[PDB]
Design an enzyme around this catalytic site. Structure first.
Site, mmCIF file in Angstrom:
data_model
loop_
_atom_site.group_PDB
_atom_site.id
_atom_site.type_symbol
_atom_site.label_atom_id
_atom_site.label_comp_id
_atom_site.label_asym_id
_atom_site.label_seq_id
_atom_site.Cartn_x
_atom_site.Cartn_y
_atom_site.Cartn_z
ATOM 1 N N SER A 130 -3.039 4.289 1.660
ATOM 2 C CA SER A 130 -4.411 3.818 1.428
ATOM 3 C C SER A 130 -4.412 2.976 0.183
ATOM 4 O O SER A 130 -3.685 3.226 -0.789
ATOM 5 C CB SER A 130 -5.387 4.999 1.412
ATOM 6 O OG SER A 130 -6.710 4.408 1.219
ATOM 7 N N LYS A 141 -8.529 1.311 3.536
ATOM 8 C CA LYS A 141 -8.776 1.447 2.086
ATOM 9 C C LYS A 141 -9.794 2.530 1.844
ATOM 10 O O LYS A 141 -10.794 2.622 2.561
ATOM 11 C CB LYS A 141 -9.258 0.087 1.557
ATOM 12 C CG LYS A 141 -9.940 0.216 0.177
ATOM 13 C CD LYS A 141 -8.828 0.283 -0.894
ATOM 14 C CE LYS A 141 -9.449 0.743 -2.246
ATOM 15 N NZ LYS A 141 -8.346 0.854 -3.292
ATOM 16 N N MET A 191 -7.029 -0.600 -9.632
ATOM 17 C CA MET A 191 -7.857 -1.485 -8.779
ATOM 18 C C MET A 191 -9.345 -1.188 -8.979
ATOM 19 O O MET A 191 -10.195 -2.122 -8.969
ATOM 20 C CB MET A 191 -7.501 -1.306 -7.284
ATOM 21 C CG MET A 191 -6.067 -1.750 -7.016
ATOM 22 S SD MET A 191 -5.611 -3.441 -7.371
ATOM 23 C CE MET A 191 -6.732 -4.311 -6.258
ATOM 24 N N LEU A 216 -11.119 1.018 -6.929
ATOM 25 C CA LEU A 216 -11.700 1.154 -5.609
ATOM 26 C C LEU A 216 -12.524 -0.061 -5.126
ATOM 27 O O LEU A 216 -13.652 0.142 -4.634
ATOM 28 C CB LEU A 216 -12.542 2.428 -5.487
ATOM 29 C CG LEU A 216 -11.809 3.782 -5.584
ATOM 30 C CD1 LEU A 216 -12.861 4.885 -5.661
ATOM 31 C CD2 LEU A 216 -10.869 3.978 -4.401
ATOM 32 N N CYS A 222 -8.101 9.436 -7.045
ATOM 33 C CA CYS A 222 -8.104 8.122 -7.675
ATOM 34 C C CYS A 222 -8.062 8.240 -9.197
ATOM 35 O O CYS A 222 -8.954 8.900 -9.715
ATOM 36 C CB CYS A 222 -9.469 7.452 -7.327
ATOM 37 S SG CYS A 222 -9.557 5.820 -8.103
HETATM 38 C C1 LIG Z 1 -2.713 -1.426 -5.201
HETATM 39 C C2 LIG Z 1 -2.991 0.069 -4.932
HETATM 40 C C3 LIG Z 1 -4.224 0.620 -4.633
HETATM 41 C C4 LIG Z 1 -4.282 1.879 -4.161
HETATM 42 N N1 LIG Z 1 -5.472 2.410 -3.710
HETATM 43 C C5 LIG Z 1 -5.527 3.658 -3.149
HETATM 44 C C6 LIG Z 1 -6.685 3.995 -2.351
HETATM 45 O O1 LIG Z 1 -7.670 3.228 -2.141
HETATM 46 N N2 LIG Z 1 -6.694 5.286 -1.876
HETATM 47 C C7 LIG Z 1 -5.583 6.177 -1.980
HETATM 48 O O2 LIG Z 1 -5.677 7.305 -1.583
HETATM 49 N N3 LIG Z 1 -4.683 5.768 -2.920
HETATM 50 C C8 LIG Z 1 -4.360 4.528 -3.256
HETATM 51 N N4 LIG Z 1 -3.303 4.080 -3.971
HETATM 52 C C9 LIG Z 1 -2.258 5.026 -4.168
HETATM 53 C C10 LIG Z 1 -1.308 4.917 -2.926
HETATM 54 O O3 LIG Z 1 -1.871 5.214 -1.628
HETATM 55 C C11 LIG Z 1 0.010 5.735 -3.107
HETATM 56 O O4 LIG Z 1 -0.463 7.057 -3.100
HETATM 57 C C12 LIG Z 1 0.726 5.360 -4.474
HETATM 58 O O5 LIG Z 1 0.874 3.993 -4.678
HETATM 59 C C13 LIG Z 1 2.088 6.115 -4.360
HETATM 60 O O6 LIG Z 1 2.975 5.384 -3.400
HETATM 61 P P1 LIG Z 1 4.007 4.247 -3.662
HETATM 62 O O7 LIG Z 1 5.053 4.766 -4.612
HETATM 63 O O8 LIG Z 1 4.603 3.803 -2.330
HETATM 64 O O9 LIG Z 1 3.257 3.084 -4.282
HETATM 65 C C14 LIG Z 1 -3.165 2.768 -4.356
HETATM 66 C C15 LIG Z 1 -2.001 2.243 -4.787
HETATM 67 C C16 LIG Z 1 -1.870 0.957 -5.069
HETATM 68 C C17 LIG Z 1 -0.589 0.389 -5.659
HETATM 69 O O1 LIG Z 2 -8.550 1.730 -5.993
HETATM 70 C C1 LIG Z 2 -8.017 2.400 -6.902
HETATM 71 O O2 LIG Z 2 -7.843 2.039 -8.093
HETATM 72 C C2 LIG Z 2 -6.956 3.392 -6.393
HETATM 73 C C3 LIG Z 2 -7.408 4.475 -5.702
HETATM 74 C C4 LIG Z 2 -6.563 5.641 -5.576
HETATM 75 O O3 LIG Z 2 -6.877 6.680 -5.003
HETATM 76 N N1 LIG Z 2 -5.292 5.457 -6.137
HETATM 77 C C5 LIG Z 2 -4.808 4.383 -6.856
HETATM 78 O O4 LIG Z 2 -3.605 4.279 -7.152
HETATM 79 N N2 LIG Z 2 -5.699 3.289 -6.991
#
Ligand SMILES: Cc1cc2nc3c(=O)[nH]c(=O)nc-3n(C[C@H](O)[C@H](O)[C@H](O)COP(=O)(O)O)c2cc1C
Ligand SMILES: O=C(O)c1cc(=O)[nH]c(=O)[nH]1
Ligand SMILES: Cc1cc2nc3c(=O)[nH]c(=O)nc-3n(C[C@H](O)[C@H](O)[C@H](O)COP(=O)(O)O)c2cc1C
Ligand SMILES: O=C(O)c1cc(=O)[nH]c(=O)[nH]1
Lengths: 311, 311
Positions: A19, A43, A69, A71, A130
């Site tokens: 996500s 998202k 970010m 959200l 988040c």
């Molecule tokens: C650009 C970005 C935005 C993200 N937004 C969310 C989100 O909207 N909801 C969610 O549950 N986590 C979000 N995350 C966290 C990711 O889903 C994931 O849990 C985190 O990046 C760990 O995985 P990775 O090592 O592959 O990046 C976000 C991560 C990134 C980098």
């Molecule tokens: O949109 C965000 O900043 C976002 C949400 C979330 O749950 N995790 C994260 O890494 N970024």
């Protein structure tokens, strides 16, 4: 070889976006539908559309990513409309996943009630972690508040629900959270959201590299794999078997995927690496995981799921 | 160029070992004395000698280390004897640091009383964050228990005291801990102990790589640098100026040291990189930090200490 059963549904393979990555618009979601991902997730949404934090708010790092970010999303109704129309088309194997990250308990309950009342037949992910909205702590570091919220959710929500959790670093926290989660008919826990409030500095400019929160951002990527694996493994040995696991954090290669699955993950999400590579990642990583299984003589994920050995 | 004032004492440079690395015996400590380290610290001690956890309990990783030592040490009396004979020789610039990690509140109070009653004139570090003794959680993730212990400590302990803290990942925890710590005449906080309960897997053997605790160990080195910098910076902007900071986590190069110092650290400790390279690291990293300062035209750490810029 990568056929997976999760939440009583069938998927071609365990791989999904995480996500927040490549899933903000309908065009993004259709690109994930078109890719080789087994499943995909929207998202995290809030009741209102959100611009998110000020830019620069995402930076690629040699060992992963840092981002705040805030959200950014197009609002709950946009996503609900999209998943409700795509379910009607019956145009992919396995249900779509719908992530919500309400800015309060009331917002989450209101969105969960709208999902419950809608015809949505897919899977919901409640984001309790988040780390990037200014002034809003990760809810799932407040065990009392988390239990209180979930008890209210399960008075009405009967559809498949998983929770997206922050990383924990103390084994008694795993014990406490498993005890909380095990009292509910939860479909899954998704372990891990980004490692919260990390910092990255450009030493030449002597300054942080993202604008929000004085440069403090969630950390993803190779930095966090050890913690992600431990969180998957620790919940796999403590949750009742009715609650499955989605593994997220530091997955870039088939080897990384193979280590999450060995820990007990059933589905796998890709954040940072998918951000960097785009949806072509799914075909690459599937082939890398199948090559590891072929070398080992494994023809299904059940040949090694959960089977990490201790010394 | 690297002259540092900390805890009212003068050091030639800010670099030290981290507690647990190269400091278990008198021979280890004398090797640190002999190296270019500006200061050094003893292995965390317990009232009795301890063998520590079963082997393999430390492994070098490409991006750092994983370890579950289990506080092996030669016991409080041995270290107290050593520091109390070295003080008498007046054979180095700046006081020795003495780490304690009692297995209970009673053990810590008893060791602090012995330090207070002894002639020791150096600096004490109270370790509230070992993540590797089976069945003993990091005390500094229990805010109430931490505050209760520290209040009892400051009823009698008047000598220089710092606390070694686990990484925090939620900004409200930094608020809570700074409010607790700011009520006391603490000398310093040392941020960060290893990231707790990480996991590393050898995918070929399909097994973990350390023996204790099913392979769950503290993570150090490049994995944890974003978290360590954030912890140093977050406490630098919240603690009263009377409480200084020691930065620890991911320091391998002069650049890494420069980033911690920009965050606000005054002394710097090296764990994993020193485990890998031995005490020759201090000459190397001192020269690398001096070259960064030379290129920038800086002739003292006060030219950039604490000066990290936000966007
Ligand atoms: C650009 C970005 C935005 C993200 N937004 C969310 C989100 O909207 N909801 C969610 O549950 N986590 C979000 N995350 C966290 C990711 O889903 C994931 O849990 C985190 O990046 C760990 O995985 P990775 O090592 O592959 O990046 C976000 C991560 C990134 C980098
Ligand atoms: O949109 C965000 O900043 C976002 C949400 C979330 O749950 N995790 C994260 O890494 N970024
Ligand atoms: C082998 C080993 C044992 C350690 N033992 C202690 C200890 O006795 N007391 C202490 O406070 N921390 C100990 N630490 C943690 C470190 O002092 C330091 O906080 C952690 O390794 C982070 O720094 P690094 O990235 O340079 O490794 C241990 C670390 C290692 C790798
Ligand atoms: O000796 C241990 O296991 C140890 C102590 C501590 O405080 N930190 C750590 O990383 N290891």
């Amino acid at each position: 070889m990568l056929n997976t059963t999760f939440a009583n549904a069938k998927f071609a393979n365990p791989f999904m976006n995480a996500s927040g990555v490549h899933c903000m618009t309908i065009e993004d979601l259709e690109e994930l539908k078109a890719s080789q991902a087994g499943a995909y997730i929207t998202k995290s949404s809030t009741l209102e559309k959100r611009e998110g934090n000020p830019l620069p708010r995402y930076v690629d790092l040699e060992l992963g990513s840092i981002a705040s970010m805030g959200l950014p999303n197009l609002g709950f109704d946009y996503y609900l409309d999209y998943v409700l129309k795509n379910q009607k088309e019956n145009a992919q194997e396995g249900p779509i996943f719908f992530s919500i990250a309400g800015m309060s308990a009331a917002e989450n309950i209101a969105m969960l009630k709208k999902i419950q009342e809608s015809d949505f037949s897919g899977i919901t992910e409640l984001n309790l972690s988040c780390p990037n909205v200014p002034g809003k702590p990760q809810l799932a570091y407040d065990f009392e508040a988390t239990e209180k919220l979930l008890k209210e959710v399960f008075t009405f929500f009967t559809k498949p629900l998983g929770v997206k959790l922050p990383p924990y670093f103390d084994l008694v926290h795993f014990d406490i959270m498993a005890e909380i989660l095990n009292q509910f008919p939860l479909t899954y826990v998704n372990s891990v959201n980004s490692i919260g409030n990390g910092l990255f500095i450009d030493p030449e400019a002597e300054s942080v590299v993202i604008k929000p929160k004085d440069g403090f951002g969630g950390i993803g990527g190779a930095y966090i794999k050890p913690t992600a694996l431990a969180n998957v493994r620790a919940f796999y040995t403590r949750l009742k078997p009715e609650i499955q696991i989605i593994g997220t954090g530091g997955i870039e290669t088939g080897q990384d995927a193979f280590e999450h699955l060995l820990c007990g993950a059933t589905m796998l999400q890709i954040g940072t690496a998918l951000h960097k590579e785009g949806p072509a990642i799914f075909d690459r990583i599937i082939k890398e995981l199948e090559e590891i299984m072929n070398q080992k003589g494994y023809q299904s994920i059940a040949d090694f799921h959960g089977k990490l050995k201790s010394l």
